[PDB]
Design a protein around this ligand. Sequence first.
Ligand SMILES: [Cl-]
Ligand SMILES: [Cl-]
Ligand SMILES: [Cl-]
Ligand SMILES: [Cl-]
Ligand SMILES: [Cl-]
Lengths: 271, 271, 271
Amino acid sequence: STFVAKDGTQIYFKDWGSGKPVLFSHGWILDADMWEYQMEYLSSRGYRTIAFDRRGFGRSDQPWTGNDYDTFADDIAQLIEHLDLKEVTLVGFSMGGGDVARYIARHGSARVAGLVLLGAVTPLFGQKPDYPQGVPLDVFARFKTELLKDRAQFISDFNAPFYGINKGQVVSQGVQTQTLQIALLASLKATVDCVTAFAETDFRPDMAKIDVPTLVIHGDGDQIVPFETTGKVAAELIKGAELKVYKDAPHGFAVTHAQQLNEDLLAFLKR
Amino acid sequence: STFVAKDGTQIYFKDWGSGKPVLFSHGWILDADMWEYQMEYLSSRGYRTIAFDRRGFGRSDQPWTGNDYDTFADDIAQLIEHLDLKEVTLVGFSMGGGDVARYIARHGSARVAGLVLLGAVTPLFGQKPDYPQGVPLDVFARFKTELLKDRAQFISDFNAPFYGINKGQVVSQGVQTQTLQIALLASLKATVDCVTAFAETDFRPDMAKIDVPTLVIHGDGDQIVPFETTGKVAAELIKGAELKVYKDAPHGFAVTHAQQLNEDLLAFLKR
Amino acid sequence: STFVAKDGTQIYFKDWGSGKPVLFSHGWILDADMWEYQMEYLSSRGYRTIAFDRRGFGRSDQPWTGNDYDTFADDIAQLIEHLDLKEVTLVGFSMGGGDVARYIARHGSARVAGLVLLGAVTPLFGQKPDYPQGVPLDVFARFKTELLKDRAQFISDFNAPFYGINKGQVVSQGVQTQTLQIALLASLKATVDCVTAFAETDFRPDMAKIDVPTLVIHGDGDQIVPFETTGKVAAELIKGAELKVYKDAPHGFAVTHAQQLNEDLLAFLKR
Ligand SMILES: [Cl-]
Ligand SMILES: [Cl-]
Ligand SMILES: [Cl-]
Ligand SMILES: [Cl-]
Ligand SMILES: [Cl-]
């Protein structure tokens, strides 16, 4: 399915099953397919599951402008409006944790039953004056330089630390092939602009606005989005949030810990 | 090109050339591109060729519902009506033999000049009480279990018995790459529901409804859809059907036996 | 974005940034993504960048008919008209040098500020009675035969001479994977007809119609489109054209010499 955002950007989404809705926001160089197993799992068990390709990614249009969290958050608002969703459980992975938090901050939580932040960049990923423990901006600047030289090889090399294959996690060649295939669908421009966005955007004000049940899940072996300065802090800053730590899990844990995640999502929805 | 099915599903198709129409229905985890050489061959020789991506596959939408042979047959009916096709020769490969057969069973043959069943699941693939020679259902249940764990690696491993590479057929790396790339476009949900559909659907009543010239072609090395219990029987059950057995040919014989298939299709059309 | 051509063919394009427009025409078995680094570079520096997927390629429709330079040129005209572009700099790579030249030839240069020809087939690629130095037609006949047997393996094998990898150019596996992925999106029919088109079409008359500033760039290690009989002659035949030769550069120099190309394009636009 598609809808057209305010600026004319066409956004691809899937809307499966019926019942209470669960809306998924994918990570960086991924698309809505990263959620296919969670969607099948929950839609076969009485839920409606919705997942979009972020602007610039997968099957969506690739606009030059609007590659920032405020626009990402408003794109989600438009999707929710378009389908007239109510009591939605928002689920964000990695950089996609930021647009679901920012949606709540910009639009409130009247339509929202709950929030799930999976290996998410919230509440803040990069360094700030009062957050020297964040990732230094020159680290991201280097990634951008590499992406602007050869993004295809960048993505290909990113598979190992993403899935923790370099630390003994086991992920098939098939999954690695699918990951690269999907990543190459994306815009070079959106790919690089998203680094800027997740490097620099501060979601600490957003955390104070989250007034729904919230589950934070993070792998403490995550090489991409460090657990200690992201998920651990998000769970403390969000009132009433629950935290689950998957021991030694990598960033790409929707793959390596698929069944555990499916069960945790179900348990949260049935709380 | 696209048409929209009754339930809102957008379906991609290609419609090439002019003349008497030949409408192709692809196999499992493939899409309309599996026919590109047959389409070029026949459309360069004065036929109109049409091939669609089944719902849930290729460039088509991925609906949660309607992944069953009655709906697939009705999709084909909608395409035929969409383009107002007459004297159409229907050509179905593998699981795609089922939806062309079920189209005739549900809609009759007023628009149909002839039927070709290529390595097809017809008349019945899975075991029934009166068909113990069919494939036991626990075989398909295991496939579903494996697809719900890692469909990307399932498809990758499937290449070998599909093309008979495991038994000495020679197929390029290029073709194996293209096969996996196209398979990964598909929905996880459609991929799994199709297994249920081809495992359990009985097309034996459909065979009695086929009242047009019919050619059945099957490889006798077919490791996926066994000739003895499918194409052999389909040819005996359809009145006036002709049977061609490709010696030592695998399931993926539109690739391994491309030229022979092209020439046999042309001869059938010219009969 | 998309527009619909005269014959109903839907063509995908990207339109990025603002400022003076630069319209890019890709090579054979590529798509608009081949320009992503040039588009990012120029659109980050005050230019509007536009690149389309040629009919039969990438994300565009795959028509049976119209796979010829006159139609290609008219598709470009229709895109220029669709966006009401003025003072456009046309940039064509490889076979795409032909449709920008033919667009000037058929429609004039009222809308055009400049022309850039990159490893282009202009002014004539294949042999003619007065051009025995051209590539013999049996060479292209053999490519077509191979493509009509196994286009996927043809493309895979083409990576090496395209990028000069067989002559010590260094190109990542990621770029080669991306090149194959994009090529496989294309129509078999379009892929084959384009060979006929660039083999046989004579752009020598077109050269005399080009009355705008023109930069010709070509690598003199080009194994696909020989510098001596194409770019070298195009630069001599177009009044006032500038020529730059990249020493030992291959056909796929937008990849191997990306930064040098970006800087040359920018220098040209600023002249
Ligand atoms: Cl269960
Ligand atoms: Cl608390
Ligand atoms: Cl009979
Ligand atoms: Cl010169
Ligand atoms: Cl040089």
